[PDB]
Design an enzyme around this catalytic site. Structure first.
Site, mmCIF file in Angstrom:
data_model
loop_
_atom_site.group_PDB
_atom_site.id
_atom_site.type_symbol
_atom_site.label_atom_id
_atom_site.label_comp_id
_atom_site.label_asym_id
_atom_site.label_seq_id
_atom_site.Cartn_x
_atom_site.Cartn_y
_atom_site.Cartn_z
ATOM 1 N N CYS A 108 0.823 -1.221 0.000
ATOM 2 C CA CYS A 108 0.000 0.000 0.000
ATOM 3 C C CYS A 108 0.857 1.271 0.000
ATOM 4 C CB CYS A 108 -0.947 0.013 1.211
ATOM 5 S SG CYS A 108 -2.079 1.441 1.326
ATOM 6 N N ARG A 111 -0.082 4.643 2.854
ATOM 7 C CA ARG A 111 0.118 4.497 4.290
ATOM 8 C C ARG A 111 0.410 5.756 5.105
ATOM 9 N NH1 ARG A 111 4.100 -0.455 5.037
ATOM 10 N NH2 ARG A 111 4.578 -0.202 2.782
ATOM 11 N N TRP A 280 -9.178 6.002 -0.792
ATOM 12 C CA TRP A 280 -9.544 6.690 -2.021
ATOM 13 C C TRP A 280 -8.555 6.235 -3.092
ATOM 14 C CZ3 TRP A 280 -8.425 9.916 2.421
ATOM 15 C CH2 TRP A 280 -7.080 10.399 2.485
ATOM 16 N N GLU A 285 -4.553 3.580 -10.831
ATOM 17 C CA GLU A 285 -5.310 2.340 -10.642
ATOM 18 C C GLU A 285 -6.428 2.281 -11.647
ATOM 19 O OE1 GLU A 285 -6.122 1.122 -6.560
ATOM 20 O OE2 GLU A 285 -5.576 3.212 -6.047
HETATM 21 C C1 HEM Z 1 -6.288 6.464 2.046
HETATM 22 C C2 HEM Z 1 -6.087 6.299 0.737
HETATM 23 C C3 HEM Z 1 -5.326 5.078 0.146
HETATM 24 C C4 HEM Z 1 -4.634 5.045 -0.996
HETATM 25 C C5 HEM Z 1 -4.406 6.247 -1.938
HETATM 26 C C6 HEM Z 1 -4.077 3.711 -1.176
HETATM 27 C C7 HEM Z 1 -3.283 3.273 -2.213
HETATM 28 C C8 HEM Z 1 -3.090 1.943 -2.515
HETATM 29 C C9 HEM Z 1 -2.692 1.390 -3.797
HETATM 30 C C10 HEM Z 1 -2.422 2.189 -5.099
HETATM 31 C C11 HEM Z 1 -2.602 0.072 -3.668
HETATM 32 C C12 HEM Z 1 -2.224 -0.947 -4.765
HETATM 33 C C13 HEM Z 1 -3.605 -1.308 -5.330
HETATM 34 C C14 HEM Z 1 -3.605 -2.213 -6.522
HETATM 35 O O1 HEM Z 1 -2.618 -2.217 -7.291
HETATM 36 O O2 HEM Z 1 -4.621 -2.932 -6.694
HETATM 37 C C15 HEM Z 1 -2.959 -0.253 -2.307
HETATM 38 C C16 HEM Z 1 -2.932 -1.512 -1.770
HETATM 39 C C17 HEM Z 1 -3.355 -1.889 -0.526
HETATM 40 N N1 HEM Z 1 -3.868 -1.036 0.437
HETATM 41 FE FE1 HEM Z 1 -4.076 1.005 0.187
HETATM 42 N N2 HEM Z 1 -4.444 2.948 -0.091
HETATM 43 C C18 HEM Z 1 -5.264 3.753 0.710
HETATM 44 C C19 HEM Z 1 -5.902 3.369 1.861
HETATM 45 C C20 HEM Z 1 -5.901 2.100 2.396
HETATM 46 C C21 HEM Z 1 -6.643 1.642 3.561
HETATM 47 C C22 HEM Z 1 -7.668 2.433 4.388
HETATM 48 C C23 HEM Z 1 -6.299 0.363 3.791
HETATM 49 C C24 HEM Z 1 -6.836 -0.571 4.893
HETATM 50 C C25 HEM Z 1 -7.371 -0.044 6.015
HETATM 51 C C26 HEM Z 1 -5.353 -0.022 2.787
HETATM 52 C C27 HEM Z 1 -4.784 -1.260 2.713
HETATM 53 C C28 HEM Z 1 -4.209 -1.775 1.582
HETATM 54 C C29 HEM Z 1 -3.865 -3.173 1.407
HETATM 55 C C30 HEM Z 1 -4.015 -4.374 2.373
HETATM 56 C C31 HEM Z 1 -3.274 -3.232 0.018
HETATM 57 C C32 HEM Z 1 -2.781 -4.522 -0.658
HETATM 58 C C33 HEM Z 1 -3.972 -4.994 -1.513
HETATM 59 C C34 HEM Z 1 -3.644 -6.301 -2.202
HETATM 60 O O3 HEM Z 1 -2.704 -7.062 -1.779
HETATM 61 O O4 HEM Z 1 -4.351 -6.560 -3.220
HETATM 62 N N3 HEM Z 1 -5.120 1.058 1.949
HETATM 63 N N4 HEM Z 1 -3.193 0.913 -1.607
HETATM 64 C C1 LIG Z 2 -7.935 0.484 0.175
HETATM 65 C C2 LIG Z 2 -7.583 0.665 -1.270
HETATM 66 C C3 LIG Z 2 -7.296 1.935 -1.776
HETATM 67 C C4 LIG Z 2 -6.994 2.068 -3.139
HETATM 68 N N1 LIG Z 2 -6.703 3.273 -3.692
HETATM 69 N N2 LIG Z 2 -6.956 0.980 -3.930
HETATM 70 C C5 LIG Z 2 -7.230 -0.258 -3.468
HETATM 71 C C6 LIG Z 2 -7.178 -1.383 -4.487
HETATM 72 O O1 LIG Z 2 -7.455 -2.707 -4.033
HETATM 73 C C7 LIG Z 2 -6.416 -3.641 -4.380
HETATM 74 C C8 LIG Z 2 -6.951 -4.891 -5.069
HETATM 75 C C9 LIG Z 2 -6.625 -6.147 -4.276
HETATM 76 C C10 LIG Z 2 -6.106 -7.208 -5.258
HETATM 77 O O2 LIG Z 2 -7.149 -8.146 -5.530
HETATM 78 C C11 LIG Z 2 -7.015 -9.406 -4.882
HETATM 79 C C12 LIG Z 2 -6.729 -10.403 -5.973
HETATM 80 C C13 LIG Z 2 -5.556 -11.139 -5.885
HETATM 81 C C14 LIG Z 2 -5.288 -12.055 -6.895
HETATM 82 C C15 LIG Z 2 -4.031 -12.854 -6.804
HETATM 83 C C16 LIG Z 2 -6.159 -12.240 -7.972
HETATM 84 C C17 LIG Z 2 -7.321 -11.477 -8.030
HETATM 85 N N3 LIG Z 2 -8.167 -11.651 -9.078
HETATM 86 N N4 LIG Z 2 -7.585 -10.575 -7.032
HETATM 87 C C18 LIG Z 2 -5.781 -6.478 -6.554
HETATM 88 N N5 LIG Z 2 -6.276 -5.123 -6.330
HETATM 89 C C19 LIG Z 2 -7.555 -0.436 -2.113
#
Ligand code: HEM
Ligand SMILES: Cc1cc(N)nc(COC[C@@H]2C[C@@H](OCc3cc(C)cc(N)n3)CN2)c1
Ligand code: HEM
Ligand SMILES: Cc1cc(N)nc(COC[C@@H]2C[C@@H](OCc3cc(C)cc(N)n3)CN2)c1
Ligand SMILES: C[C@H](O)[C@H](O)[C@H]1CNc2nc(N)[nH]c(=O)c2N1
Ligand SMILES: C[C@H](O)[C@H](O)[C@H]1CNc2nc(N)[nH]c(=O)c2N1
Ligand SMILES: [Zn+2]
Lengths: 404, 405
Positions: A108, A111, A280, A285
């Site tokens: 993420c 953070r 947000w 993305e």
């Molecule tokens: C506040 C604004 C936030 C922004 C701009 C942001 C940004 C991002 C981005 C760009 C990703 C990669 C997403 C992707 O490629 O699908 C991500 C992943 C992630 N974020 Fe955030 N984030 C935010 C808030 C949060 C919050 C509130 C949480 C949990 C409370 C969080 C937890 C995570 C987690 C666990 C991932 C990994 C998701 C995965 O493995 O698919 N984020 N974040």
């Molecule tokens: C909290 C938050 C903020 C923000 N700006 N963007 C996000 C995006 O959510 C991330 C999701 C989680 C991931 O999906 C889970 C997943 C994993 C795998 C291996 C396959 C699949 N189809 N789906 C890929 N993008 C989350």
């Protein structure tokens, strides 16, 4: 023992001491690095240790470490595990675990915001029906007319006897993907399977490219149930371009709320199989991955033809040019509709700030370079030049199997 | 599943298992507890023999004479030689084979579909710094080929017990001066500040342009290094212009044709070639994105966005992205116009996918460093962004080595 960590743009060096607090192995060995893999290949004594360590974390975080209340809390947890096999968190402890799980998330980039998280306690949920109410309130809160506010809602933890509470959808807002006779897809190809699962449990499908899916919510050991989100709760943003007039006519749009709903929240050994969270969007993305990935909406070609670019050869860089405008369009439209967005430069700059903050606070910050670095203009952002250590700390968000 | 890393491409949904990683004889920096894969550099009679035997085994495998009499006699020859000298020597075709395999094995190189087409100049007879210079000049001439570029490596004598190394002090054959100014800034290439200062310290008369080609500092065994100026006609450069932005030519930006890495150690069968410069042709993002736009390199992004009239006061205009694309198009346009081999980041990554598939069939995998393979602009627009990759060290290899000073 402790990795040296260098920024290549500034020549500055830190040392990660935090990684020594990891207790969960990742995928890499000395023989080979597997850090670019998306997924892994994947007991009272050990639950007691995770719980102890987490309570320790909590009382330390409120500076009351070692005190009476701390001792008495360690006694409650122990007495509870010894007798029942498990325990429960106090709402305040939960709130802390959730923030911390976010802070610990290596993938993420958002953070810097970790301390500002609205935590909705939904542990007194006993039905798909209730799940739905809680989910609707989360969305209303999180959306806040465009002024997005980070939020998590936590459903009842996993238990020895029974099936899990589960949101079947990967996100709370998802567009239908429709498999066609000719094997092609209308809508979002990422959501083929979930679209079909919805239809099978009785959803009347649309036929658009942007039909918001219903929720399939599952209470323990029960068939999942179908719930339609009221359209006025799902804030969407129609896409247009500041200078390119035709763009709007592509009929493109994306929703405002990125709400992950298939991931497991682990705190102090306890597991929360439904704990949807949202912040947000960062514009890459939507702009780059969701609209430009070839196995997503795959719109590059359309756009470049509209821009009248030479599509015949890679070296005109038509793909890079089209992508840039699509990203610009996303930023423009979100700004115009007064919905919260952050571009990848602004976001990565603040991630750098966060890295510094974390070095002083904890001695390190687990971070997954492949995921932090944006999917366009990598080296144009400061994170590209930054070395990063990846490890697993608890509380954590984890992937978990699909419930079917 | 088999007990080998499962490897997935998330675009096509296709799956493979890397079994080649089994051949790795050396530990990288990662452990179960933390991944260190984003770091650029992370921190003997019997050892030599066993590295040697393994390389000889590879050679004889590769010619399909594994287990033959010529194989067992070569093995015997190798151990006899170490028994009496402490070292051993490669046959000509062994060096050719292992040089190719070292390229083949390089996790950070996207250009590896070309690995079977390397001209190997044998310079193991070389005995002075002057002769190193002649070899290098011949290398540059051949490799450059008036713009029809050809991959090549020149191999100088290997390290000996107690005797000093052959070393090319410069990190590439072609490098632009970086002059540290009184105001603390740098004119030219800031990457090359130390080497420029060493060049002057060793008696070079410096210029004061942004694009002065550095001289070569060449070290023969136990001798202080000697200075050699490349004849300007041997160094092919490309003046940069843009296909439609008429003012871009007026910036006087230029880049040289030949990327020739001169400071890496070629290790084969335990033998260590401290001077072994190799060269290919550029991928356009190395020039237009990194060397021109890195903040710690030429840093021209702002200047170019100003000329383009972008709003440089706000990140959300994407002024950085728009300018980088144009600088990148200018690099491609200008190399094309000048008939100098170059490849864009799309063509290159596509061909690296073909290479992955060839290697899957041939060896059961391919060591690849994802952070280096994915281009520094347009990452996910390229098919390699979506391809999982396994990283590990195989020998023969190119390694980094401590600076000679
Ligand atoms: C506040 C604004 C936030 C922004 C701009 C942001 C940004 C991002 C981005 C760009 C990703 C990669 C997403 C992707 O490629 O699908 C991500 C992943 C992630 N974020 Fe955030 N984030 C935010 C808030 C949060 C919050 C509130 C949480 C949990 C409370 C969080 C937890 C995570 C987690 C666990 C991932 C990994 C998701 C995965 O493995 O698919 N984020 N974040
Ligand atoms: C909290 C938050 C903020 C923000 N700006 N963007 C996000 C995006 O959510 C991330 C999701 C989680 C991931 O999906 C889970 C997943 C994993 C795998 C291996 C396959 C699949 N189809 N789906 C890929 N993008 C989350
Ligand atoms: C044929 C044209 C070639 C292309 C397009 C190419 C492409 C590249 C690129 C883009 C890089 C990354 C450069 C950087 O970011 O610093 C690289 C690295 C590398 N290449 Fe190639 N390559 C080519 C030929 C060669 C040849 C002929 C060799 C050796 C015989 C070679 C060996 C290496 C090695 C060892 C690295 C890693 C260098 C390092 O770690 O700094 N490549 N290649
Ligand atoms: C052969 C080739 C073809 C092509 N298209 N591109 C290249 C790029 O060369 C790679 C450069 C040279 C390397 O320098 C390594 C280095 C530099 C310094 C100052 C010290 C050190 N130990 N190692 C890193 N990137 C090489
Ligand atoms: C295979 C590769 O690891 C995969 O494409 C990753 C790369 N980086 C990513 N980075 C982010 N932020 N999100 C992603 O989905 C991915 N995908
Ligand atoms: C910290 C990070 O590993 C570093 O910036 C790497 C990233 N990827 C790279 N990739 C290539 N090809 N060349 C580089 O110099 C770098 N730099
Ligand atoms: Zn690793």
């Amino acid at each position: 023992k402790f990795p040296r960590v260098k920024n290549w743009e500034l020549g500055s060096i830190t040392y990660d001491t935090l990684c020594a607090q990891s207790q969960q192995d990742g995928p890499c060995t000395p023989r080979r690095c597997l850090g670019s893999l998306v997924l892994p290949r994947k007991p009272a004594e050990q639950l007691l240790s995770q719980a102890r360590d987490f309570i320790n974390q909590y009382y330390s975080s409120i500076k009351r470490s070692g005190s009476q209340a701390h001792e008495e809390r360690l006694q409650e947890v122990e007495a509870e595990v010894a007798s029942t096999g498990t325990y429960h968190l106090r709402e305040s402890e939960l709130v802390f675990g959730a923030k911390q799980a976010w802070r610990n998330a290596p993938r993420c980039v958002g953070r810097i915001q970790w301390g500002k998280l609205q935590v909705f306690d939904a542990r007194d949920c006993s039905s798909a029906q209730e799940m739905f109410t809680y989910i609707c309130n989360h969305i209303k809160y999180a959306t806040n007319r465009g002024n997005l506010r980070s939020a998590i809602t936590v459903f009842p933890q996993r238990a020895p006897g029974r099936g899990d509470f589960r949101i079947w959808n990967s996100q709370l807002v998802r567009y239908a993907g429709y498999r066609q006779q000719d094997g092609s897809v209308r809508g979002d190809p990422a959501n083929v399977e979930i679209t079909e699962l919805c239809i099978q449990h009785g959803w009347t499908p649309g036929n658009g490219r942007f039909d918001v899916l219903p929720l399939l919510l599952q209470a323990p050991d029960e068939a999942p149930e179908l719930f339609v989100l009221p359209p006025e709760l799902v804030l969407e943003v129609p896409l247009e371009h500041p200078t390119l007039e035709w763009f709007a006519a592509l009929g493109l749009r994306w929703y405002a709320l990125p709400a992950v709903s298939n991931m497991l929240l682990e705190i102090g050994g306890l597991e929360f199989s439904a704990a949807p969270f949202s912040g947000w969007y960062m514009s890459t993305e939507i702009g780059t991955r969701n609209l430009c990935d070839p196995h997503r909406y795959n719109i590059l070609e359309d756009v470049a033809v509209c821009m009248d670019l030479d599509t015949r050869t890679t070296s005109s860089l038509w793909k890079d040019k089209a992508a840039v405008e699509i990203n610009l369009a996303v930023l423009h439209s979100f700004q115009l509709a007064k919905v919260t967005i952050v571009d990848h430069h602004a976001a990565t700059v603040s991630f750098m700030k966060h890295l510094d903050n974390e070095q002083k606070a904890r001695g390190g910050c687990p971070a997954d370079w492949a995921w932090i670095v944006p999917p366009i203009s990598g080296s144009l952002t400061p994170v590209f030049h930054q070395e990063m250590v990846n490890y697993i700390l608890s509380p954590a968000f984890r992937y978990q199997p699909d419930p079917w």
